[PDB]
Design a protein around this nucleic acid. Structure first.
Ligand SMILES: Nc1ncnc2c1ncn2[C@@H]1O[C@H](COP(=O)(O)OP(=O)(O)O)[C@@H](O)[C@H]1O
Ligand SMILES: [Mn+2]
Length: 451
RNA sequence: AGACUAA
């Protein structure tokens, strides 16, 4: 038994058995991250188990550190700074960090216990990680615990909460607004507002500030200096991307959720390419996670969730299912086994197995294009499997006529390392490297030979 | 688009 949000003395021996995958399917705010996880970790240390803890984002990682503070844990994330002796048997890192380590030339510890928090995360690295973890369990090499309020197959956008939630459907502005949305600024409590992009977040946040509102902007770019500020009394609005979709304990009163996002889609009609489709409705699991940011305080009973529109459950055309398989086909078990996708996430798209297997230098190039080149999984796969080296940027110019990249209606020119002037016309098109002007600048640096 | 950047 336990009290005071403190960990339970009693932990089930069942969850530590090899060949055992435990799905902890508990509602938002039940105590997965900050009460259950510490109990498991303390009991893992006593059992002397080589242990891996996985967070989807740095927001979840920071939440974990608060609960795990004092324990001999090795943090492998910029989100947390702590002294490490080097003899820690418990490692903590993000989902994508682990997949990266699995794809790189050196070698993950042989964990016999793996705890993945937010085991529904649809980021391609997270899906591939679940594939690895579930084969390790199947082989009898590890015990694993998957913690999530929205396990695969979740259709309920309004799950159980610690406190009653007032669900309100209203129109929500995507852009700045002069007028017509007084309900946003008339509210007295603290609001968490989910935006599909940092661009949209910028022009919504400066719109709120000119109304004398204290606004914190959260994303991958501002996390470091800004997340400690949410752990304060000095804010009205948190305008956040999906970095805060999971795990966050903002201690707020309201979530504004437009329930929209841009989705990468692989197009198969004609030459294969990636587009950014949408904005389209988010999944029921995303809506449920976002709503899960509030109604967490049993002493605070009038929290609000303001949303717009229905969710869209069908995401089979989302590129993350192909890309997860592109990664997992190149990940190997120490025994030699390529892992298969976690049960519930199989046949989201037409497999077939080992289709994305890369050889020798191609697998290294594949990883290098993602980690050093900052290119998406699909694009990196296409370049690597064509036998192109990481530093060979020819493919950025040899695309068919229709692949010519435009910026402000003008044909993009690249000046190369050697002073050639060439039109940006890549052989493979991925809208993620050209849609946003900031993304395109980075891709222009890549095409130059300067990345 | 968003997330991750470890050894
Ligand atoms: N720093 C804190 N101070 C007070 N309460 C907290 C703090 N962090 C989390 N909580 C509360 O503890 C409960 C469980 O938190 P958590 O473990 O994050 O739940 P879950 O991971 O299942 O969403 C929630 O009610 C949450 O609001
Ligand atoms: Mn949690």
């Amino acid at each position: 038994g336990s009290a005071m949000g403190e960990p339970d003395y009693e932990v089930d021996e069942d969850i530590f058995r090899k060949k055992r995958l435990t799905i902890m399917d508990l509602h938002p705010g039940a105590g997965k991250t900050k009460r259950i996880l510490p109990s498991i970790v303390r009991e893992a240390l006593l059992r002397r188990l080589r242990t891996l803890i996985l967070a989807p984002t740095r927001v979840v990682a920071a939440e974990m550190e608060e609960a795990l503070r004092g324990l001999p844990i090795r943090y492998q994330t910029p989100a947390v700074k702590s002294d490490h002796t080097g003899r820690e048997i418990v490692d903590l890192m993000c989902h994508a960090t682990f997949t990266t380590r699995l794809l790189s030339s050196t070698r993950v510890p042989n964990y016999n216990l793996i705890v993945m928090d937010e085991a529904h995360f649809t980021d391609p690295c997270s899906v591939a990680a679940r594939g690895y973890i579930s084969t390790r369990v199947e082989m009898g090499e590890a015990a694993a615990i998957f913690m999530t309020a929205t396990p695969p197959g979740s259709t309920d956008p309004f799950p159980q909460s610690n406190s009653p939630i007032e669900d309100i459907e209203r129109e929500i502005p995507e852009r700045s607004w002069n007028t017509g949305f007084d309900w946003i600024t008339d509210y007295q409590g603290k609001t968490v507002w989910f935006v599909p992009s940092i661009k949209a977040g910028n022009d919504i946040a400066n719109c709120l500030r000119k109304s004398g509102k204290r606004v914190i902007q959260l994303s991958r770019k501002t996390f470091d200096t800004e997340y400690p500020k949410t752990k304060l009394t000095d804010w009205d609005f948190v305008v956040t991307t999906d970095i805060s979709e999971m795990g966050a304990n903002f201690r707020a009163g309201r979530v504004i959720d437009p329930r929209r996002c841009l989705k990468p889609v692989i197009l198969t009609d004609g030459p294969e390419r990636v587009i950014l489709a949408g904005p389209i409705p988010v999944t029921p699991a995303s809506a449920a996670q976002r709503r899960g940011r509030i109604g967490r305080n049993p002493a605070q009973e009038d929290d609000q969730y303001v949303f717009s529109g229905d969710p869209l459950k069908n995401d089979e055309d989302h590129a993350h299912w192909t890309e997860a398989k592109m990664l997992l086909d190149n990940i190997y078990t120490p025994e030699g086994i390529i892992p298969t996708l976690f049960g519930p996430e199989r046949e989201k798209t037409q497999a077939i197995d080992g289709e994305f297997r890369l050889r020798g230098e191609q697998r290294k190039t594949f990883v290098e294009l993602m980690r050093r080149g900052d290119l998406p999984v699909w694009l990196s796969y296409k370049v690597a499997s064509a036998g192109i080296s990481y530093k060979d940027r020819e493919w950025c110019f040899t695309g068919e006529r229709n692949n010519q990249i435009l910026e402000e209606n003008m044909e993009v020119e690249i000046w190369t390392r050697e002073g050639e002037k060439k039109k940006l016309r890549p052989k493979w098109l991925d809208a993620r490297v050209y849609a946003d002007p900031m993304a395109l600048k980075d891709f222009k640096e890549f095409a130059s030979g300067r990345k």
